[PDB]
């Protein structure tokens, strides 16, 4: 018995022995409103298949990244603005 | 005269090293009186330097273009010392 005087090896209740405890895992019911919960359920059930979620995430994120970096001009990143400066002649002429 | 090295008894840059070290030690010698211990020690080091350079000259050491004695190890009878 786990509740005896300084007994912590209830061999039947191995969860209390090994420390298997929801230390803060309240089993209290849903505190949210039902209507907004149903709203989020119906509007996020597309993101229920973890594999399809991963494929969508990777492919759409790569697409959006390529789109941003291809449609962005040099005003938002200097690498695409270009030199906008004459090139300096290197040492020893240019070599 | 081997290995393109002139002897130190007939080298220009070796004498230049001598003159430069002597002027360096004399620049540190015009700050004390010529009879006190620092000036006497500086003059002793000066004579030490001059005799050092003259001894490296008279032994037939070979001084290169940099003006420093380059020792010959090949086994030349002149350079067994």
């Amino acid at each position: 018995k786990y509740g005896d005087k300084s007994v912590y090896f209830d061999l039947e209740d191995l969860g209390n022995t090994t420390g298997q405890w929801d230390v803060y895992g309240s089993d209290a019911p849903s505190p949210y409103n039902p209507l907004q919960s149903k709203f989020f359920e119906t509007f996020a059930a597309p993101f229920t298949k973890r594999g399809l979620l991963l494929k969508f995430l990777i492919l759409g994120g790569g697409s959006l990244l390529t789109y941003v970096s291809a449609n962005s001009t040099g005003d938002v990143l200097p690498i695409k603005r270009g030199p906008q400066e004459p090139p300096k002649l290197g040492p020893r002429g240019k070599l | 005269d081997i290995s393109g090295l002139t002897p130190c008894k007939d080298s220009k840059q070796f004498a230049k090293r001598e003159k430069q070290q002597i002027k360096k030690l004399e620049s540190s010698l015009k700050l004390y009186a010529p009879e006190s211990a620092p000036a006497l020690a500086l003059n002793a080091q000066i004579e030490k330097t001059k005799r050092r350079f003259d001894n490296y000259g008279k032994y037939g050491l070979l001084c290169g273009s940099d003006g420093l004695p380059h020792l010959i190890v090949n086994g030349d009878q002149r350079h067994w010392g």
Partner: protein, 143 residues
């Protein structure tokens, strides 16, 4: 078939104010090596998880983390306090494997009733080179 296991009951545990070197999630999914000992008096001993514990007069019980913890504790017990000890292995399913003497006698007294394994009847230089056991599961030392 000469020494039966002891099947540790719900014994009391030592008086201890609690530490952080105790049982982590390894116990919750794997074994955690209970130890049992029997004290003549209520004395104080160093715990292998750090800190000082007060063992109780009579049988005690400690579920610490692993085999080396309980065996180090038991060696300190047997040497410093001159006390018989025995420890176990408690899988999460429920089974309790008895392990320390496995014969009622500590593993120094060569008491008959134990079969010799890990026993190569040769000097240590007469093992074959690896090329002689190349492309075989036996590495160098199982022939």
């Amino acid at each position: 078939g000469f020494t039966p296991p002891q099947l540790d009951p719900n014994t009391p545990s030592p008086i201890f104010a609690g530490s952080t070197g105790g049982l982590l999630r390894k116990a919750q999914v794997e074994e955690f090596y209970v130890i049992t000992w029997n004290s003549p008096k209520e004395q104080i001993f160093e715990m292998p998880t750090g800190g000082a514990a007060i063992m109780r007069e009579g049988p005690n019980l400690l579920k610490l983390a692993r085999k080396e913890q309980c065996l180090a504790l038991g060696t300190r017990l047997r040497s410093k306090y001159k006390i018989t000890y025995q420890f176990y292995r408690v899988f999460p399913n429920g089974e309790v494997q008895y392990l320390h003497p496995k014969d009622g006698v500590y593993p120094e007294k060569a008491n008959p009733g134990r079969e010799g394994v890990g026993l190569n009847m040769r000097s240590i230089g007469k093992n074959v080179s690896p090329i002689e056991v190349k492309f075989t599961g036996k590495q160098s030392y199982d022939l």
